[PDB]
Design brief:
part of a larger assembly, 4 chains, mainly alpha, binds a molecule of 3 linked components (NAG-NAG-BMA), binds a molecule of 2 linked components (NAG-NAG), binds 2-acetamido-2-deoxy-beta-D-glucopyranose, Spike protein S2' (chain A), viral protein/immune system, SARS-CoV-2, Spike glycoprotein
Chain lengths: 22, 48, 57, 87
């Protein structure tokens, strides 16, 4: 139900969704 | 009786989520706010 | 004689290619539901553009 | 030239990218392609009508993983967001 050229980096979250689910 | 009520209530939650989506407005609002902030930041590049 | 330009008068204002995006550009367009002069010959003005059409046989 | 960070200048527009054979289908008269934020993303090769993409050649931060120097002078670098074949 829930839905790049200029230094706009998007870091990844340290806890990935599988670990949140765990 | 309590078991049946609790199970049926879980089921109603399942349905309520599965049918309407405006219950998750809170998270979607955060995501949209950040997306629009980035889009404004980028579209500022095309200004003199 | 006059008529009602329902929905016509839209042209790709530039050369780019866009996919599934709602673009918003400001240029010279034919205002919707406007007044087109039904004809069947003389001179006409050219204020800033034209939507010359035809339903020919 | 393809698959190299090149400094292209197609007939009208310029810029640096990594030209790659795409699968987008322009219309016969269109020349560019743009992104949702109005950035160039696809260019029609004005000589041979094959539509190329444009991927800005990789940049990104460089982090230096390290145990405290009170432990060792050894480190390990982390390049952010690269296919690890561009280092
Ligand atoms: C306290 O409230 C609960 C509300 O769930 C009452 O239980 C429910 O009572 C209704 C009315 O009798 C039941 O509906 C009927 O069920 C029978 C089952 O065969 C069916 O033949 C009828 O057509 C109708 O659907 C309902 O089943 C029942 N729910 C459960 C889980 O048993 C309960 O009776 C109330 N307590 C007191 C002391 O009144
Ligand atoms: C532009 O000129 C080039 C010159 O080679 C054309 O490329 C040739 O296209 C023909 C068409 O069948 C084929 O023989 C080959 O694909 C190409 N090489 C040669 C040696 O002919 C190209 O088609 C031209 N395109 C336009 C739009 O003018
Ligand atoms: C102009 O448009 C109006 C509204 O549709 C229409 O009634 C009218 O006949 C048109 N022509 C003139 C000269 O007003
Ligand atoms: C920190 O440095 C001091 C002096 O170099 C050393 O004696 C100490 O053991 C160090 N701490 C650790 C945890 O290694
Ligand atoms: C990295 O580049 C190689 C080049 O052969 C390619 O096969 C591979 O899929 C690339 N990896 C990613 C994650 O893009």
């Amino acid at each position: 139900k829930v839905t790049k050229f200029n230094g706009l980096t998007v870091l990844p979250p340290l806890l990935t969704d599988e670990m949140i689910a765990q | 009786l309590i078991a049946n009520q609790f199970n049926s209530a879980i089921g109603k939650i399942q349905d309520s989520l599965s049918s309407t989506a405006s219950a998750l407005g809170k998270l979607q609002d955060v995501v949209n706010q950040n997306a629009q902030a980035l889009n404004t930041l980028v579209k500022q590049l095309s200004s003199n | 004689a006059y008529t009602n330009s329902f929905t016509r008068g839209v042209y790709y204002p530039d050369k780019v290619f866009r996919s599934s995006v709602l673009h918003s550009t400001q240029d010279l367009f034919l205002p919707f539901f406007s007044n087109v002069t039904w004809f069947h010959n003389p001179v006409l003005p050219f204020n800033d553009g034209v939507y010359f059409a035809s339903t020919e046989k | 030239v393809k698959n190299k960070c090149v400094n292209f200048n197609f007939n009208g527009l310029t810029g640096t990218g990594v030209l790659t054979e795409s699968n987008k289908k322009f219309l016969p008269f269109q020349q560019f392609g743009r992104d949702i934020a109005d950035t160039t993303d696809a260019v029609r090769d004005p000589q041979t009508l094959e539509i190329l993409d444009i991927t800005p050649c990789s940049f990104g931060g460089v982090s230096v993983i390290t145990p405290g120097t009170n432990t060792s002078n050894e480190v390990a670098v982390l390049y952010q967001d690269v296919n690890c074949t561009e280092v």
